[PDB]
Each structure stands twice: as structure tokens, then as C-alpha cells.
Symmetry: C2
Subunit: 308 residues, 2 copies
């Protein structure tokens, strides 16, 4: 009955293996080992329920409680970005920045074709996950989001923050899912985004759990507790805090670097294990972002290039 | 929506006031202030449920989850004590200790006429409370025990330990309860112990919460993480760890001291706000207890004197 040693061991191992599988994408042990340890913890929690915890690896299998889908206001409204469609657009963007605050470093990142989500952490624990909604108000899908291994149940520091991310289904998992749908003459999902939408906006988290979803975190509502002085530093810091970020981001020195990054990802996007619908470009320096401010709708320091 | 500051403030205040009321028995603020803050936190948790936590002051109100009453084995079986009925009995106990290990210090304590319970802490959180049962196997009444303010939801150090206590209803609260029963067509409880048993065997934790219960903690299953060298030092340490212990305990030098402690409490027992059915006497020193060991039934190092 005092099983503390084994429970804490199992927590440590399953947490390490999940991170290796789902974040690093670099496994140390085969599935058979993960599954064995997971079934053991599950058995322990069934027979000794006093060992259940909010951040237990068993949270990932989903369970009884259903997503409320209640309307909930974000702590901080999510941004709405202006779009760019060609080099001309990006050069205008660049010139307006260079005329106001001078020559700036940019960060470039892939625009994941996913479902935007806000993930609120209180005392470092994942306590609420909302769809973006209208940007001010979203739907509570917390119980479903909890089953995504790429979302940490506890971060490395006990912060009170709302992180923003893109939830998605990997391309191949989508294709395999569709193969199963056809096998069972069900209607196939249109694309990975629709499949991930369907998977998140349903009532049984155990069904979400069986679907293959991940996330990339791209920002946070409040930088107060961050050492970061730039967007790129913020993403590195999110990495250190335990979050899953996109490794294909790049700092560039000028608009020629931004154009180069877009040209690269025009050709390379095909090979990615997820769909992207564009490239987001941001003035890197956080203070300089503040200097540029917002229009009535959108940051003046960011633009979303859209692939045709 | 980021209500972290007010929530932590409310936890801090309500935890302080609860302890002052129910543990120190020395309030600093009137009920009106406690109730006002509690009602505020409840409203916050209703409208912002992401702020609910396992150790929230709101736990004390009770909830929807019911005690399972499942049969559960204790981590460590609870002791069964031999009895003494007079001075001769206590002298024989004393003589057999001093013939085998020499002259020892004793701890004397009041034997609370309550319901014996084991309270299991994992990582310092109260996770399971069982009735004593047969000493090996008890009934799970965790949800009900959670509503007793004198049981800490979180201890001051993250230990994995099973503490042992006596749960009871104060005499005056028993009397007032009985007065209420004599308003409806309702049968009165026989005595405080019976009232407390009835209160803890409810299916509705919200009813248990409305009853006035308390606890005294008297021991632990495992002293491994305790710096205590004696029973009295262990009780002091439980105090510092955040538990509710009985302050009427005394260290005495010999059997003459034990007899005087019993004579004192024969007279003073009537003035106590709870019922006692005896006095427990223990070899104080933990190593010496280990030295005396056990018969097939009972520690050789302890005895329960029983009032007639």
C-alpha cells in the first residue's frame, strides 16, 4: 500500500518517454516498454486510487469527464494578423516599419494550418484549454486537449500564463485515419485540419486520445515572467519551460532574408509532416513590437504571408 | 480572468482563519469576515472553475462526490492496546518494562472516545482517510473526512505517511445537535461518539460538513522522515507539520507521575469539550519501544487505562 516509490518512478519514466516520443521525436525505448509501464500505472491507479494526480501520465488516455464546450473569455484576447500575398506586400510591411523605428530583426515562422487554441496555466499546471473562437471568447475543450502529449500537464516553473498554440493532426495520421474511414465506409475528412477539428470538437476525450494530435506553441499572453527580450528568445524560453515549439523558425536581418525564408518554404513545405498555409513574420524585439503598436484590428509589427 | 492574485490571497486568508478557528481555537477575525471571503472564493470557483484545486478552502463545504465506503487495507495495520483498570495493573505494566529495559520516561495522553481513523498523505496531500475497521482493513470515508477543518488538506512537508487520529464531535455540538433533533419527529443520538459515527457514515459530504467535527492526531505509521526521538517529540513534529494534536499530553519520569496524571484527569475530564474513555501511557523513547516489541496482540510498551 505505500507505493510512492514505484508511482514516482513510473511517473518519471512515462514522462520522459512521452517527451522523447512526442516532443523530441527521438524515442529511447520501444512502444512495448512505454505500453507496459503505462498499463502498470493504470492498474496501480485502479487498485490504489489515492495515487491518482492531475498530472498523471494516465490523463493522456482520456476518461470520464467531458469537455463542457462552454463559452469562456480568454484572459487576453488573441491577435488578428494582416495578410500578405506577394513580395510587394512584404516590402510595404518592411518599409512602414523601417520608416518608423529603423532597421529591425525579424523572426520568421511557419503558419501551421491547425486549430488555434489558448492554454492557460495556473501555478504551472494546465487548467484550461479554449479554441480561439472570435478571439475574445472561445469554447472550453480542456478535457480533450489534455490527451495531446505535446501539451505539458505541468510546466518547469509555476507560472500563471496563457500560452497560444496551433493544434493539428500530422498529415500521415490523417491519411491513415481516412484509410480506416473508407474501410468502414464512413465519410472521409476533407483535410488534416478538419480531422483535428472533428477530433477536438466531440464529447468523449477517450476518442480524442486515440486520434493522433500534436501542437506548436507560438506565443504567450503576458511576458512579465519571461527573461526573453525577443520573440525568438521567448520561443527558446517556452522550450525550456517544457512546451512544444516549431524548430523551423528563423531570425533574419532584413526583408531579403524574409523573402529567402518564404522561397525556401515554398519548395520545402511539401516534405513537412504537417500542413502550413503560410509564413508569419514578426518584428523580433518585444520592445520594438510595443513601439509599433496596433491598428484598430491588427499588430503593426506582424504579418501573415499566405501561400496561394 | 487572470485572477491568480486574488485566488492566492483568498487561499492564504481562509487557510489562516480556518487554522485559528479550528486548530488554535483563537480567532483573529469574526465569522462574518470568514464567511464573506469563503463566499467570494466559491463564486470565483463557480465562474472561473480553472481556479479549483484539491486543497482549496472550498473543499470544506463538501461536494457531489460520495465516500465509496470501499474496504481498503491500511498501509500499516493499526495497533491494538492492552487495558489497565487500576493502579495494580499500571504498576505491573511499569514493573515489566523496568525489569527488561531499565527506568524509562513515559508519555501520557487522553484517550479520545472517538472514531479511530488512518489519514494517508502522499506528496504531503491528504489523499485517503479510512476508519480503523479491524485494524488491517477499514472503510473509505475520504470525502467526508475532507470536510473536517482540523485535518490539513496539505501538510508543511511533502511526506508519504499514514497518520492516525481520533475523529470526534465536541460535547456541546452534540448537545445542540440533539436539541435540533428534538424539533422534528427525530430520534436523538446516544452520545457524541454515536453522533460523529452517524455524521461520517453519511453518503452526502455536504451533511458531514454541516456537522461540527474535529480530530486529534496521535501517531504515524512510519517515523523514517521524522527527526523525533520520542513519542512526545513526534507529536510536537506533527504540530509543526500542520496537524491537530492534543495539548493535554505530558511526559512523566515514572509510574508515580503516570498515576498523578490519571488522578488529575479523573477530576478534570468533566471540564473537557470532548469525551475521553481513558488515558494512554507509552514508553516515550522510540528505540526503547522497539526494544520492548510486541506480543502476538499488542505493544508491550503501551497500555490504555480505562475509566470505570
Amino acid at each position: 500500500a505505500d507505493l510512492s516509490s514505484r508511482v514516482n518512478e513510473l511517473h518519471d519514466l512515462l514522462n520522459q518517454y512521452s517527451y522523447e516520443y512526442y516532443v523530441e521525436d527521438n524515442p529511447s525505448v520501444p512502444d512495448s516498454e512505454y505500453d507496459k509501464l503505462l498499463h502498470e500505472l493504470i492498474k496501480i491507479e485502479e487498485e490504489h486510487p489515492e495515487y491518482k494526480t492531475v498530472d498523471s501520465p494516465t490523463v493522456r488516455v482520456g476518461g470520464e469527464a467531458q469537455a463542457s464546450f462552454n463559452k469562456v473569455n480568454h484572459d487576453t484576447p488573441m491577435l488578428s494578423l494582416g495578410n500578405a500575398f506577394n513580395e510587394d506586400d512584404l516590402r510595404k510591411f518592411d518599409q512602414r516599419i523601417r520608416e518608423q523605428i529603423g532597421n529591425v530583426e525579424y523572426m520568421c515562422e511557419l503558419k501551421i494550418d491547425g486549430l488555434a487554441v489558448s492554454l492557460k496555466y495556473v501555478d504551472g499546471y494546465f487548467v484550461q484549454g479554449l479554441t480561439r473562437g472570435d478571439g475574445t471568447t472561445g469554447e472550453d475543450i480542456t478535457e480533450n486537449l489534455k490527451t495531446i502529449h505535446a501539451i505539458p500537464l505541468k510546466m518547469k516553473e509555476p507560472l500563471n500564463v496563457e500560452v497560444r498554440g496551433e493544434a493539428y493532426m500530422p498529415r500521415r495520421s490523417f491519411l491513415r485515419l481516412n484509410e480506416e474511414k473508407e474501410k468502414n465506409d464512413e465519410q472521409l475528412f476533407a483535410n488534416p485540419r478538419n480531422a483535428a477539428a472533428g477530433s477536438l470538437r466531440q464529447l468523449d476525450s477517450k476518442l480524442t486520445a486515440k486520434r493522433k494530435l500534436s501542437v506548436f506553441i507560438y506565443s504567450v499572453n503576458d511576458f512579465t515572467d519571461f527573461n526573453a527580450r525577443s520573440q525568438s528568445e521567448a520561443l527558446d524560453e517556452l522550450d525550456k519551460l517544457g512546451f512544444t515549439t516549431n524548430k523551423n523558425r528563423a531570425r533574419v536581418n532584413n526583408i531579403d532574408g524574409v523573402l529567402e525564408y518564404i522561397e525556401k518554404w515554398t519548395s520545402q513545405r511539401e516534405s513537412l509532416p504537417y500542413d502550413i498555409d503560410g509564413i508569419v513574420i514578426k518584428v523580433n524585439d518585444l520592445d520594438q513590437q510595443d513601439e509599433m503598436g496596433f491598428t484598430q484590428k491588427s499588430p503593426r509589427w506582424a504579418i501573415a504571408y499566405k501561400f496561394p
